[PDB]
Amino acid sequence: DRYYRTLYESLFDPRLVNSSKQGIYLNLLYKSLKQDALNVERVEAFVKRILQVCSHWLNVGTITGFFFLLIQLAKTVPQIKNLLTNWEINNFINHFHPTVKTYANAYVTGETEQIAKPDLGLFTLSHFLDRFVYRSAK
RNA sequence: AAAACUUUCAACAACGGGGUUCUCGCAUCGAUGAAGAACGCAGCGAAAUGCGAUACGUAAUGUGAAUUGCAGAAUUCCGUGAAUCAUCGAAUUGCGCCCCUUGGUAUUCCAGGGGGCAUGCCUGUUUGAGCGUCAUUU
Numbered sequence: 001d002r003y004y005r006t007l008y009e010s011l012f013d014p015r016l017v018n019s020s021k022q023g024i025y026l027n028l029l030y031k032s033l034k035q036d037a038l039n040v041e042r043v044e045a046f047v048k049r050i051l052q053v054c055s056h057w058l059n060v061g062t063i064t065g066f067f068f069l070l071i072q073l074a075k076t077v078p079q080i081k082n083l084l085t086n087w088e089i090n091n092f093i094n095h096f097h098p099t100v101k102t103y104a105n106a107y108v109t110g111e112t113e114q115i116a117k118p119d120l121g122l123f124t125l126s127h128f129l130d131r132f133v134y135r136s137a138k
Numbered sequence: 139a140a141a142a143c144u145u146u147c148a149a150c151a152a153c154g155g156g157g158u159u160c161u162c163g164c165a166u167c168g169a170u171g172a173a174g175a176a177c178g179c180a181g182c183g184a185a186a187u188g189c190g191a192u193a194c195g196u197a198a199u200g201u202g203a204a205u206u207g208c209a210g211a212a213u214u215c216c217g218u219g220a221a222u223c224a225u226c227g228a229a230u231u232g233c234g235c236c237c238c239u240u241g242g243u244a245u246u247c248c249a250g251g252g253g254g255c256a257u258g259c260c261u262g263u264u265u266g267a268g269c270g271u272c273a274u275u276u
Contacts (some may be wrong), residue, residue: 021140023140023141024140024141027139120140120158
């Protein structure tokens with residue numbers, strides 16, 4: 001209980017937004033939530049707070065990561081989908097990044113087959129510039 | 139089990155770096171403590187009061203046994219004498235003398251109360267003294 005309490009707290013840590021190691025945090029969150037499938041209320045509370053934190057981030061790769069995780073956590077814990085029928089997702093459906101929008105749409109629609117696991121180092125700004133200047137060359 | 143490492147930016151954090159002398163002008167002094175300084179002062183004090191390095195003060199005059207929160211001196215006390223005492227004209231708390239009036243066993247001794255008296259010098263009033271000089275039978 002104390003570990004999940006500290007994780008639910010650290011989700012609101014402001015320094016997390018500018019942390020290079022957000023991928024490790026993503027993997028840790030996925031593993032923790034997967035291991036807690038029995039506590040439906042607790043995992044739903046983490047899902048809600050995860051979206052809360054995501055709404056105010058600038059790193060695209062992390063946001064795509066959370067959406068992919070939520071999609072996968074939905075498979076192990078289908079009761080998470082009840083929240084969509086029983087509000088934040090509307091913003092991500094209207095996110096500026098097309099990839100984030102598609103991931104959100106897939107999570108809402110449940111259409112998971114067209115999602116590759118998002119990879120950090122992709123969607124980052126330098127990579128976008130490398131595409132956008134039209135000269136990558138491997 | 140995807141991070142570390144080097145380099146360059148960028149933040150953020152450490153680290154880091156009154157006197158003295160000269161010149162110029164202005165003219166306004168008080169024995170009643172100016173302007174300026176500051177320990178804050180008392181044996182141990184915060185305010186109040188008192189004071190000025192002579193600092194809860196020094197001198198002089200008076201009174202007469204205290205001060206007081208603590209400590210400590212004592213006052214040879216029958217008085218040259220404490221007092222955060224008084225007055226105040228300039229620890230010396232220096233050095234004194236005597237008169238008047240009442241009582242307590244009172245001729246001794248004691249206790250109160252009152253009043254003067256420092257010294258020098260000038261003038262005058264009063265009182266004496268000198269083997270200093272002298273008159274003294276109308």
